[model samples]
Target chain A: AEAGITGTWYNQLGSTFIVTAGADGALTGTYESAVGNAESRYVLTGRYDSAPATDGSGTALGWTVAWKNNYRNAHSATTWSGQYVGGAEARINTQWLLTSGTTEANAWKSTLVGHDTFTKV
Target chain B: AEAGITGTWYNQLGSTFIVTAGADGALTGTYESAVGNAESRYVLTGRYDSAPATDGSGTALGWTVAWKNNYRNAHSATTWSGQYVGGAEARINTQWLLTSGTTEANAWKSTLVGHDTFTKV
Candidate 1:
């Protein structure tokens, strides 16, 4: 069941997003809100492995960090890298803040809600 | 999740039956036709293992004997041996008759129809 990786991430807000992992471990994707909101622009970039875990548990693990807003404006960047288990649904809840600059004095944190169901596809 | 095995057998003829196996490796069951016809007398005896199959294959194997008329009328008995695969259904169809007896002129043949689902109970 191997094919070009293609999937969409959505929430109760009716937002649709695309995520892709290439064969060379490079990840890139974009997100957009269905309701056409000004804050609906986000870009995702990460790395992943297509092999099984070393524990012989038949589980696959991968890490990815989605940085939206193009990393502009010193305190406006968010990053996340998490491991996902294979054959099961992975739900990730992360809050990120600008780790440098005056943003430290007025740090802002936002929760990123996302989930992926890993299958043979 | 091990529990006592309890089940009923039914057919289009409105017949009901019982089957049981004890912890000491014993099996017994009875069948009665709800229509009260003269063809509802049948007894079942069998054995089953609660463990998965060998050869790395998740399946189970068992044997059963269904003798009627209290096994006295030696002329009325049917036996079968079958193997069931895990997570799959196994269907068995068999025909039996008296292997011996000069009443060969009065020998009878019957088709046995039965199936069981294997699961972690």
Candidate 2:
């Protein structure tokens, strides 16, 4: 099937994300922010489930990914549940959540929502 | 005198650090982990004192820099006290500390120490 999400991607905030899809369809990679200020920059790891399924209905295109900060510091953990949009798989629409921390925690927790548009780099 | 610590530097852990020295001698930059994983990557802000102080003894080459994660996650804050070594200002020896969080906070707090060697890139 498609390339399966292996390659580099960029977020709207100017962060760079590099993803590697394993032979079994496992997803893994790193995300780096472009901001030069430490408070505005961040690096994180992502993991996702395999693609396609035994049912063969072709409905297994969506994936749930968990992204955690490498340092386990405050405001470092989050989850992104996304799915490929359209036939080209050129973009992914994700609903994200901040799992912990004080800043942004209230809004992120109370709302239980966030979003990101990832475009292939 | 000297460039005053402006430029990119890499740590032994393979993390990339970009620094900017303002006309006022203020220091600011981002730190990106080499690891593609999220927990290990972080972006932070740094501040430093001016070079070549008025003290006739000329001992004011050190700087204390505080770094806080952009997202403010669990283990997100730390401080770095550093000084340029030798006459070229090409290298710096820094002692770091974690100010919050359960992970590494105790070791970082009790010991009140950690070390890093930064080489200009």
Candidate 3:
């Protein structure tokens, strides 16, 4: 029952992004795709098999990273509680907003725009 | 209202590593600090707090990369099940092994050799 794989995910536009766990127990490497002439930011998520003892090649699952927060200004306090759900695909669910003196004027957001299904490659 | 931080950890010697979650609801980024001139492949684990929506300053911890597997040869199938423990620091907890043909020979390894504490800077 070993499902081992490794690779890197890139933004459809630029190279600024974050890798976070989704509501599903899957990993999501997300990128910001709004900046000028930037590709759409994307997230890459997947799973591994076996108990990673050492780094003969690398460690297995069990050992994971979860998205907590960013620069502190942009916060999703009401979103992901920091736990990656298992067996589900991860996606980009974000909204664009404009602010003025602590108040948001106009904004646009995406609810589960893009996602990757877990598959062994 | 925000705790932001970012950095990488290196083994006192080599280039092998693995990041795991601790039992303390914290992320334990572990690694193998053994072999050759490698400075004991170490795991540098830390914490970031903020609502990671996009990647301006890199997505916060909400999203992450967990150690899953190698090239399909080695396996820690039972150790870390793909979840990074939060709050607690990660360390190297491995036992070296000697193998012959298809079994282990005489080996040497380390357990919790080094660890880092989480602090907001």
Best candidate, DockQ: 3
Candidate number that wins on TM-score, 1 or 2: 2
lDDT string for model 2 (A1-121, tens) is 2364677777787876666655532344555665644443333323232333333211112222222233323322334444443345466545453322222223223213456778875
The DockQ-derived docking category for candidate 2 is incorrect
Per-model DockQ: 0.01, 0.02, 0.08
Could you give candidate 3's per-residue lDDT for residues B1-121 as a string of tens digits? 1211223324334344343333322343444534643343333332222332332222222212222323223322112111112234432211111111111221112111111222221
lDDT of 2 at B97: 38
Best by TM-score: 2
Clashes of each: 0, 28, 69
**DockQ score for candidate 3:** 0.08
Candidate 1 vs candidate 2, DockQ winner: 2
Candidate 1, residues B1-121: lDDT per residue as tens digits? Answer: 0133445434332445466656655557765535565455676776655563466443222334344454234443444344333332322222222222335332221222233333323
Candidate 2 vs candidate 3, lDDT winner:
2
RMSD of each: 23.1, 16.7, 15.5
Position A48, candidate 1: lDDT: 55
For residues A1-121, write the lDDT of model 1, one tens digit per residue: 0123446545433555566666666667775645576456666666655564477332122333333354333233444444444334433222222222234323221222233333222
Alpha-carbon runs more than 4 Å astray in model 3: A1-47, A50-60, A63-121, B1-4, B10-32, B35-74, B77-121
